[PDB]
Amino acid sequence: SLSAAAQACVKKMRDAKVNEACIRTFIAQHVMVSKGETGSIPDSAIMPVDSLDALDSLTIECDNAVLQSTVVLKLNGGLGTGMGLCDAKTLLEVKDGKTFLDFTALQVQYLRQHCSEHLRFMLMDSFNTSASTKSFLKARYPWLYQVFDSEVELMQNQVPKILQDTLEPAAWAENPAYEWAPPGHGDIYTALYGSGKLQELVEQGYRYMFVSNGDNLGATIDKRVLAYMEKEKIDFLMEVCRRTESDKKGGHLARQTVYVKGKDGQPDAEKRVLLLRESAQCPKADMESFQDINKYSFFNTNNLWIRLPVLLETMQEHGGTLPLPVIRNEKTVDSSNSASPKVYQLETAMGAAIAMFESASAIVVPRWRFAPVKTCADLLALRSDAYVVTDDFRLVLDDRCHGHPPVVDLDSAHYKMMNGFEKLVQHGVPSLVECKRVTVKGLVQFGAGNVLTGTVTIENTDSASAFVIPDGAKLNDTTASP
Numbered sequence: 001s002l003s004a005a006a007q008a009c010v011k012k013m014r015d016a017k018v019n020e021a022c023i024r025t026f027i028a029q030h031v032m033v034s035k036g037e038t039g040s041i042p043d044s045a046i047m048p049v050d051s052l053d054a055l056d057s058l059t060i061e062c063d064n065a066v067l068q069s070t071v072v073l074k075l076n077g078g079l080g081t082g083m084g085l086c087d088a089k090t091l092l093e094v095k096d097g098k099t100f101l102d103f104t105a106l107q108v109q110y111l112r113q114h115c116s117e118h119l120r121f122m123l124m125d126s127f128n129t130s131a132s133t134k135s136f137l138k139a140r141y142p143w144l145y146q147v148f149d150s151e152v153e154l155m156q157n158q159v160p161k162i163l164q165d166t167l168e169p170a171a172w173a174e175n176p177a178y179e180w181a182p183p184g185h186g187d188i189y190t191a192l193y194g195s196g197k198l199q200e201l202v203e204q205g206y207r208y209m210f211v212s213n214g215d216n217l218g219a220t221i222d223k224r225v226l227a228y229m230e231k232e233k234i235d236f237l238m239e240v241c242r243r244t245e246s247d248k249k250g251g252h253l254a255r256q257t258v259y260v261k262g263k264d265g266q267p268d269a270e271k272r273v274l275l276l277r278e279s280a281q282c283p284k285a286d287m288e289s290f291q292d293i294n295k296y297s298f299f300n301t302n303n304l305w306i307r308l309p310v311l312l313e314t315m316q317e318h319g320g321t322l323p324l325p326v327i328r329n330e331k332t333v334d335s336s337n338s339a340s341p342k343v344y345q346l347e348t349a350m351g352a353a354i355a356m357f358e359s360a361s362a363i364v365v366p367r368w369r370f371a372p373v374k375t376c377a378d379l380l381a382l383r384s385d386a387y388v389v390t391d392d393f394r395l396v397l398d399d400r401c402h403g404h405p406p407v408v409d410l411d412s413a414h415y416k417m418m419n420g421f422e423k424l425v426q427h428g429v430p431s432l433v434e435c436k437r438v439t440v441k442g443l444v445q446f447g448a449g450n451v452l453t454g455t456v457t458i459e460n461t462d463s464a465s466a467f468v469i470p471d472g473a474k475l476n477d478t479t480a481s482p
C-alpha cells in the first residue's frame with residue numbers, strides 16, 4: 001500500500017536493523033508528508049489558552065508509594081549546532097568547575113539522600129553524545145556509570161533523511177552517516193516503547209516519568225505535581241511558564257475547540273483540547289504572531305509528566321506507535337554544503353504528546369523551574385550572578401529578578417558560536433542580577449568585575465578593534481562606546 005519511496009525507506013531501515021517501532025512511526029509520518037503535511041499550524045486554526053491551574057496554589061504532596069514509582073529522565077541527545085557545539089551541551093560549564101551534568105548528578109544524589117533512596121534516573125542519548133556522557137560519569141560519578149548501560153542510558157533512534165521532491169532516502173557517498181538524523185526529542189516515546197524499556201518499567205512497578213531538557217537545571221521532581229495528577233487522574237501534564245521577552249526559541253501552548261455534539265437532550269458542549277506549537281510549526285511568514293508573547297503567553301518548559309502505563313496502553317492501541325504530529329525540517333543532506341541534495345528531516349516534539357491523551361492538561365509553574373539555555377546569550381545569563389545554586393542543586397533566578405531573566409542581546413556575528421562567546425567573557429562574567437537588559441553590538445570583551453545595572457548597551461562601531469571594557473567598570477542605564 002505504500003509508495004515506492006516509502007518502501008525504499010522501510011527497506012533501508014530494516015537493512016540497518018532499525019527497530020520496528022521506529023520504522024512504523026517514521027512511515028506514518030512519511031505518509032502524512034506525501035499527502036502534503038508539513039507540520040505547519042497557522043494561527044487561524046488555534047486560539048490562546050486563558051485559564052490554567054497553578055503549581056503555586058498546590059500544597060499537598062504525594063505519598064511514598066507514588067514517589068517511589070516515579071522515574072526521572074533527562075534529554076541529552078541533541079546537537080546544539082546553533083551554539084557551535086560539536087558534543088553534548090550538558091558538558092559545558094555552568095558555574096565554576098561544574099557542568100550541566102554535574103548539577104544533574106548532584107540533584108539525583110540529593111533526591112536519593114532525602115526523598116527516594118532508589119530513585120531511578122535515566123538519560124536519553126544519541127551516538128553523538130553517548131560516549132562523552134559515559135566517560136564523564138566514569139570519572140566524576142561512578143555510581144551512575146556502573147549502571148549506565150544497565151538502567152541509565154536510553155539510546156534515541158536515527159531516521160533517514162528523505163529527498164524533498166521524491167521522498168526517497170537520501171544517499172551521501174562522501175559520508176553515509178549524514179544520511180541519518182535524530183527524529184527530535186519526541187522520539188523518547190518511540191525509543192522507550194521499541195527498546196522494551198517502557199514495558200519493563202511498568203512491569204517493575206513504575207507509574208510516572210518526569211522528563212525535562214538537559215539544559216534546564218531548574219527542573220526536578222515536585223511531589224505536589226504527583227499528588228495533583230493522582231487526584232485529578234491526569235495522564236499527561238505539561239509545565240508552562242508565563243512567557244517573557246527572552247522566550248524566543250521553543251514552543252507555546254495553544255488550544256482548539258472540539259464539539260462533543262449533544263446527546264439525550266444535552267446541547268453541544270465545547271471541550272478544550274490542548275496542543276503544542278513549536279516555532280518551526282508556525283508559518284514562517286506569520287512568525288510575528290508566534291513571537292507575540294501577549295497572544296501566546298504560556299511557554300512550554302518541556303518539564304513533562306507522563307503516566308507510564310497509560311502511555312504504554314495508548315501506544316499499543318495505536319499499532320505500537322505514538323502518532324505525534326510530524327515536523328518537516330528542511331535541510332541539506334550535508335547541512336554545511338548548500339550544494340548537497342535538499343532533504344526533509346522528519347521530527348517530533350515530546351511536548352506534542354499533550355494532544356495524545358484525553359486527560360492531558362497543563363499547569364502554570366513559576367520561573368524557578370525553567371532556566372533554559374538555547375543560545376550563548378542564555379548561557380551568559382546562567383553563568384552570571386542572575387542565577388544562583390539552590391541547596392538541592394537547582395539553578396534558579398535570583399529573587400531580585402522577580403521572575404524576569406535579564407534580556408541579553410548579543411551580536412550574532414561575534415557571539416553566536418561558543419568560541420566567540422568564550423572570548424567575550426574571557427576575563428570574567430559581568431554582574432547581571434540588577435541588569436534588566438544588556439545589548440552587545442560589535443566586537444567587545446568584558447573586563448574583570450563588571451557590574452551592569454538597568455538597561456546597558458555596549459556598541460563598538462569599528463570592529464576592526466575589539467572594545468575591552470575596563471576592569472571594575474559599572475555600567476548603569478547607559479550606552480558604552482570606545
Ligand SMILES: O=c1ccn([C@@H]2O[C@H](COP(=O)(O)OP(=O)(O)O[C@H]3O[C@H](CO)[C@@H](O)[C@H](O)[C@H]3O)[C@@H](O)[C@H]2O)c(=O)[nH]1
Pocket residue numbers: 075076077078079124156182183184185212213214215249250251252276278299300301302349350351372373374
Ligand atoms: O533529537 C533530539 C533533539 C533534542 N534533544 C534534547 O531535547 C532537549 C531540548 O532540545 P532543544 O533543541 O534544546 O529545544 P527545542 O526542542 O527547541 O524546544 C524544547 O524546549 C523548549 C524549552 O526550552 C520548549 O519551549 C519547546 O516546546 C521544546 O520542544 C535538549 O536537551 C536536547 O539535547 C534530544 O535528546 N534529541
